[PDB]
Each structure stands twice: as C-alpha cells, then as structure tokens.
C-alpha cells in the first residue's frame, strides 16, 4: 500500500480509502474495480528487494497511523507508530508465508522449526489432489474417503482452496497417559 | 481447481523449477583473504540482456 | 502441487541462512530439513 503525506484533512495517510474497499467488494459480490484498478490509480506498488532499501513500511494500517492523547494483558506486546516518514504499508504480514506454511493454525504461537516440519509433512498428507481423480490414470493416487474442512483455519486458506479440497479430519483428541501404548 | 503452469511430456506432468542466480551487469567489491597477494576485487558479470 | 509450482532451486558466503531481504518475498518456514536446507526456497 502507498502512504502519502498529502491528505489535506490531516497528516500522512494510506492512498486507499474505505470507498476503494467497498468498490472492490461490489465487484466480488457481482460474481469493474479489479487489482489492476488499484495499481493504475496509484494506491498500490511493486517493490523488489533493491527498492525496499529506500522505503519505510508500516506493519498495520489503523494501528501504525494515528497519534497519542487499559491495555489487554492477554494480547502480545507490540512496538509503535514511531515514524512519520512512512512511505508504504504492509497489505498483510501473514502474506510473508508460502502455500504450505499458510495452512498452519497460529504459527505465531510455535517454536520456529516445528512450523518448518509441518510445511513438509503437509505435502505428504492424503486428501483430494483434484476433483477429476476418476478420469486420471496416474501411477499411485491416494484419496481420503471422508475429508473434513479444518475447524481451526487461516484467512489465507481461502486463496489456497484448502476448505474446498482438504487433507485431514477433525479427530477428537485426548492428550493423556493411558495404557502406555 | 487445476491451476496449470505445467507441461505434459510423453504423458507426465512436468514443473520447471525457478532457478536462482546472481544478477548480471552488477558492480560488487569483495575483500580477499589474508594469504592472497590481492587485498580487494571489483567484479562485474557483464552479459547482454 | 500448489507448493511445487512455487518452488526455487539455488545451485551449489552463507546461502542456507534466512536473509533479512527474504522478508515477504520467500517463505521463512518452508525449506527442506535435509542437505537442501536453505537452498530450496518457496515463494
């Protein structure tokens, strides 16, 4: 997202406004305002690692953009909107992950290697590789009889079609010492 | 749900893996180790687009 | 499948380590546990 000092009605603010967001969702429901619309209206930009060196990104929009005039002890400890010189804003920090790491529930609550192990094992999990498995003649195909969409999901799974073609079941799990087996 | 982005060669579906490389026409200065008679080197991997 | 079509190979200073520049470009978690750890990246 592009952040501009010009916003007559105040300080530094994101080029995209509530209007753009509604204009987009109107097109989402009607299935005019596309991704290309945001790009040609100069609200969003493409930054490589070399251009990244000369810019200042904010993590959240709302949180990293107001000012200063109690805090939930259950939440994680975050920094601040320290800088005024913000040039860009992060669309979503969860977009730093890839297709495999994107299906991990709460990866921000695990020890880093455990997340590496999952985005490896997920690749070997039975499910439904395509809805046309009955018309394909592949050496080896493994289809899980009754797949189940996960109860615990990520927002990124929408774009990954995970809910549509899942690779597991919601087993009722007990974490206990029983027979010793 | 099939995404494409792959080829069909003699029946089998093939993916071309994105191959990483160092960018060309780029000036980079490197410090050379203690045994070397040369202290620093300025390299450019100059090749046509 | 999706994950395979978004894969990278680095053929061969510290290539295997997760670089600062990899932020938002390449996946921090998804890499092989093996002798390809840090050389096989995913977008």
């Amino acid at each position: 997202f592009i952040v501009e000092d010009d916003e007559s009605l105040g300080h530094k603010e994101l080029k995209v406004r509530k209007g753009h967001i509604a204009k987009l969702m109107a097109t989402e429901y009607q299935d005019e305002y596309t991704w290309s619309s945001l790009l040609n209206e100069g609200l969003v930009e493409y930054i490589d690692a070399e251009e990244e060196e000369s810019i200042l990104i904010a993590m959240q929009p709302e949180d990293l953009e107001p000012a200063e005039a109690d805090v939930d002890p259950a939440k994680r400890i975050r920094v601040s909107h320290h800088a005024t010189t913000f040039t860009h804003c992060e669309i979503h920090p969860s977009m730093i992950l890839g297709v495999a790491a994107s299906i991990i529930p709460f990866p921000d609550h695990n020890q880093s290697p455990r997340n590496t192990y999952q985005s490896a094992m997920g690749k070997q999990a039975m499910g439904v590789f395509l809805t046309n498995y009955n018309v394909r003649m592949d050496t080896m195909a493994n289809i899980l009889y009754y797949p189940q969409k996960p109860l615990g999901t990520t927002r990124a799974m929408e774009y990954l079609k995970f809910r549509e073609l899942p690779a597991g079941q919601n087993a009722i799990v007990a974490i206990a010492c029983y027979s010793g087996y | 749900f099939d995404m494409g982005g792959y080829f069909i060669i003699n029946g089998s579906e093939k993916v071309l893996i994105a191959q990483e490389r160092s960018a060309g026409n780029i000036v980079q200065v490197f410090k050379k180790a203690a045994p070397s008679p040369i202290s620093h080197v300025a390299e450019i991997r100059s090749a046509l687009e | 499948t999706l994950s395979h079509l978004r894969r990278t190979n680095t053929p061969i200073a510290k290539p295997r380590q997760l670089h600062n520049t990899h932020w938002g470009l390449v996946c921090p978690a998804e890499t092989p546990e093996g002798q390809a750890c840090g050389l096989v990246k995913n977008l």
Binding site: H20, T34, P61, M95 | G4 | R6
Partner: peptide, 30 residues
C-alpha cells in the same frame, strides 16, 4: 464516508482482489 481510512480487516478485500486477478501460479504463466 468514501474517503475514510482503511482498517486492518479491510486489507483482506485487497488480497481477495489480488488473487482474483493473479491466481497462485501467475509467475509460471506470465
């Protein structure tokens, strides 16, 4: 108002718009 600033929830509408246009294997195709 249409000129109101965006929220953290709103960013998913932009992402939805990104993938609707690009898809997941855009890099291979393009």
């Amino acid at each position: 108002d249409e000129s109101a600033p965006i929220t953290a929830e709103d960013s998913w509408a932009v992402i939805s718009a990104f993938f609707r246009e690009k898809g997941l294997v855009s890099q291979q195709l393009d």
